[PDB]
Amino acid sequence: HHWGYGKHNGPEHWHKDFPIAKGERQSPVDIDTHTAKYDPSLKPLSVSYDQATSLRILNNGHAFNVEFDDSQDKAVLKGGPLDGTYRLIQFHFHWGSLDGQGSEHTVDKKKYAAELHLVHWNTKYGDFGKAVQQPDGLAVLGIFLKVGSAKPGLQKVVDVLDSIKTKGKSADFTNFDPRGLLPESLDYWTYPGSLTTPPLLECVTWIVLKEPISVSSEQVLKFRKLNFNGEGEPEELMVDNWRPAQPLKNRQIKASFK
Numbered sequence: 204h205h206w207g208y209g210k211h212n213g214p215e216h217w218h219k220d221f222p223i224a225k226g227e228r229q230s231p232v233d234i235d236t237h238t239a240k241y242d243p244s245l246k247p248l249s250v251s252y253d254q255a256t257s258l259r260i261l262n263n264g265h266a267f268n269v270e271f272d273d274s275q276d277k278a279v280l281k282g283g284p285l286d287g288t289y290r291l292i293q294f295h296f297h298w299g300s301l302d303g304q305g306s307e308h309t310v311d312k313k314k315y316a317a318e319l320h321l322v323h324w325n326t327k328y329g330d331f332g333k334a335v336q337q338p339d340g341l342a343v344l345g346i347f348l349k350v351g352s353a354k355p356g357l358q359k360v361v362d363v364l365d366s367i368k369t370k371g372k373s374a375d376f377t378n379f380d381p382r383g384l385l386p387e388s389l390d391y392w393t394y395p396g397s398l399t400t401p402p403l404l405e406c407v408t409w410i411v412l413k414e415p416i417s418v419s420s421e422q423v424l425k426f427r428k429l430n431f432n433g434e435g436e437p438e439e440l441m442v443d444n445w446r447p448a449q450p451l452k453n454r455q456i457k458a459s460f461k
């Protein structure tokens with residue numbers, strides 16, 4: 204039926220509605236450190252979020268995301284394996300039913316408690332809608348979350364989750380600075396991939412940071428209180444909203460660090 208993350212509408216069923224699910228560059232993938240290739244040509248990432256303008260946070264039934272005003276050339280991502288400028292549009296997370304799983308990408312088969320995705324679109328295509336139709340239309344910055352000390356910058360996000368527990372619930376979320384979610388180092392791995400939820404378009408240049416951010420058990424726990432269902436319906440806890448690793452095929456994962 205409508206795709207989801209359940210046993211009867213989850214990732215293993217998506218290909219029926221979206222044939223590309225079995226494509227040549229699907230995401231996520233497992234990053235093998237034995238085969239990752241250091242590319243001395245890769246430029247450092249350039250992140251300019253000082254002018255980022257958050258608008259609201261919403262539960263869309265697949266996860267929760269914070270939307271940004273992508274009108275002006277405000278918050279942009281450039282450099283790295285990218286050509287041109289990419290505007291930040293929104294960010295969301297993927298997490299598990301327990302600390303031992305939740306991330307989409309894995310490193311040497313290791314799974315993290317959650318994964319943060321900052322989505323950006325290539326300005327040369329005019330708008331977000333037209334970018335998804337191109338192989339270099341989007342750039343998603345992926346950040347792993349491990350359980351440990353608390354991340355101050357994430358507190359504002361977790362404290363507001365109470366008010367958007369069910370699908371359809373939205374809340375104004377202004378003045379949130381995404382810089383507080385970034386790790387110390389910007390070293391990264393990169394490869395061409397796709398969106399990890401339907402429509403699964405292969406229009407993403409993936410940039411996965413090597414350094415995970417630390418979040419407390421208390422913080423991650425609040426993610427698990429959200430629901431997939433809308434208000435006034437069978438309760439189905441929003442947990443394990445991640446897609447398993449997909450076949451690497453003929454792709455090569457490059458590293459910006461030795």
Ligand SMILES: NS(=O)(=O)Oc1ccc2c3c(c(=O)oc2c1)CCCCC3
Nearest residue numbers: 293320322335343397398399400401402
């Ligand atoms: N893991 S992820 O960043 O690829 O997740 C997604 C998957 C699909 C979308 C889509 C849209 C978006 O804004 O963020 C997305 C993030 C809107 C329309 C394009 C396809 C669906």
Ligand SMILES: [Zn+2]
Nearest residue numbers: 235236237238
């Ligand atoms: Zn080796």
Ligand SMILES: [Zn+2]
Nearest residue numbers: 295297320399
């Ligand atoms: Zn995602």
